Amino acid sequence: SVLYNSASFSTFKCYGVSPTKLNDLCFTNVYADSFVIRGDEVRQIAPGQT
Amino acid sequence: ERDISTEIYQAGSTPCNGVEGFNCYFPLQSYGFQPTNGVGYQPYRVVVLS
To answer: What mutagenesis or variant effect is reported for residue 34 to R (chain B)?
Structure first.
């Protein structure tokens, strides 16, 4: 709930689970990877692109 | 049970009022059926008998 209310972003989505119910799901050993690319290269950033 | 009516889905906050913007999506989604696709991705035709 602290991901969209203050300010929207370009694209928010999740794979294998609805992003709306991130609260009830319970993960383990969460990593955090971040970087900066061109906006045109966003489509390359997908599970099943190149 | 069968449902026919199509309404724009709302995801969490930001009520849509039938605009399909952020966190709003069209309820249905099409296919990519082609013979060139994989064997699993090929369309099968189902006839249930009850």
So the answer is: In strain: Omicron/BA.1, Omicron/BA.2, Omicron/BA.2.12.1, Omicron/BA.2.75, Omicron/BA.4, Omicron/BA.5, Omicron/BQ.1.1, Omicron/XBB.1.5, Omicron/EG.5.1
